[PDB]
Design a binder for this molecule. Structure first.
Ligand SMILES: Nc1ncnc2c1ncn2[C@@H]1O[C@H](CSCC[C@H](N)C(=O)O)[C@@H](O)[C@H]1O
Ligand SMILES: [Cl-]
Ligand SMILES: [Mg+2]
Lengths: 217, 217
RNA sequence: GGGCUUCAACGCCC
């Protein structure tokens, strides 16, 4: 099963974009700004401390990359930071399991623009050019997940796609905010539950609906 | 939705047991032994790495308690540590989203043997006595989730349950090891995928199959 | 330089 990348704009797949991801570095030696560790610093910066939540992006990557859909080679993930940085994640990257270690890696990615293994010329993580729509499959239904939107059953929604049409889901990698982070890109907004879901739960729900629709065990 | 506890022996529900959980304490004040804080002193302190993955339990707790099946009131979670300590988790508990606060909570639970509601004397977390079977619904199918078992589709498995039959699933909240931590309790072992899964993904996959089966949206 | 790891990089250890 070939590793999926933005070069291939034909193969039917699921794509998840972790949008409004809170990934921003700051000097002291650089840290990845987070609400827990840098309350004081975020104060001086005149920032909403509540906004610094890189841990949400970390939790979603684990959920997505560990999923059967990813292991079956039918998943791509991108990260679109709240500051407009777009990142392509290699499906085979074994993301750090712990937050502190995820943090150091993100700092490096943001400063160097890619992450590589010493012997390889393949990028495990890469900063790429906006807009994401330039990189997605040509036939791709693009949706934003929103509690404000009509609720769907994921399998049923996916079954209604054309045979050659991918599905790209934009998930707000945040605790609180409006669903307008991808309004320029999406075809539709949908909700996955009568309950408000965390970003990670929304990711797993969409992955497991797609695994069902596509008969991935 | 009425809040499910082990006192209710009748109501049909899903139960998840996080087994072989890593919840070790370390003093200097007490903290949960982990890899981010303690990876450099483990050997020095005569401790195992296996003893320092409480992040796995943390991640599963969030995955489970944030799920629609929990919000619908049809889920219970228990934790059994690698030392045999058994814990009942109230469906309404808010697990802290940061590991730092999670540790404090867990340390207080292990030391006090319970955590009470901010509004009453009710215990939202409580250390209880083995075996887990004393606490499950009287009629309850019991299974261990394991890569090394025959793979099933969750929806079908759940739909085969009797109208009054609950389902309890045991998940290894650990980095690696034999999936034999519940052999004395279970009727059967089953796989959820042809790929190895994280404990968290095993959790969400079973939850989302149950949600589908029970028309929980 | 060498190691460790549900964590090539990161974070650590020697
Ligand atoms: N393919 C699969 N099907 C069902 N459960 C799985 C699974 N892969 C992993 N799990 C669950 O996730 C837990 C953590 S994976 C780590 C343990 C695993 N035995 C290794 O070695 C396992 O204990 C198992 O309960
Ligand atoms: Cl080491
Ligand atoms: Mg090294």
């Amino acid at each position: 099963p070939p590793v999926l990348t933005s070069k291939d704009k034909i193969t039917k797949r699921m794509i998840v974009v972790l949008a409004m991801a809170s990934l921003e570095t700051h000097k002291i030696k650089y840290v990845l700004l987070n609400c827990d560790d840098h309350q004081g610093l975020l104060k001086k910066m005149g920032r909403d401390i509540s906004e610094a939540r890189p841990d949400i992006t970390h939790q979603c990557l684990l959920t997505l990359l560990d999923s059967p859909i990813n292991k079956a080679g039918k998943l791509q993930v991108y990260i679109q930071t709240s500051r407009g940085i777009l990142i392509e994640v290699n499906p085979t990257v074994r993301i750090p399991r712990t937050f502190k270690r995820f943090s150091g890696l993100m700092v490096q990615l943001l400063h160097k623009l890619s992450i590589r293994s010493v012997n390889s010329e393949e990028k495990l993580l890469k900063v790429i050019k906006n807009p994401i729509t330039d990189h997605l499959p040509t036939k791709c239904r693009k949706v934003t997940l929103s509690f404000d939107a009509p609720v769907i059953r994921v399998q049923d929604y996916i079954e209604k796609l054309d045979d050659d049409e991918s599905i790209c889901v934009f998930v707000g990698a945040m605790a609180r905010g409006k669903d307008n982070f991808a309004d320029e890109y999406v075809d539709e907004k949908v909700g996955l539950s009568n309950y408000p879901l965390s970003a990670s739960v929304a990711c797993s729900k969409f992955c497991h609906g797609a695994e069902d629709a596509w008969n991935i065990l």
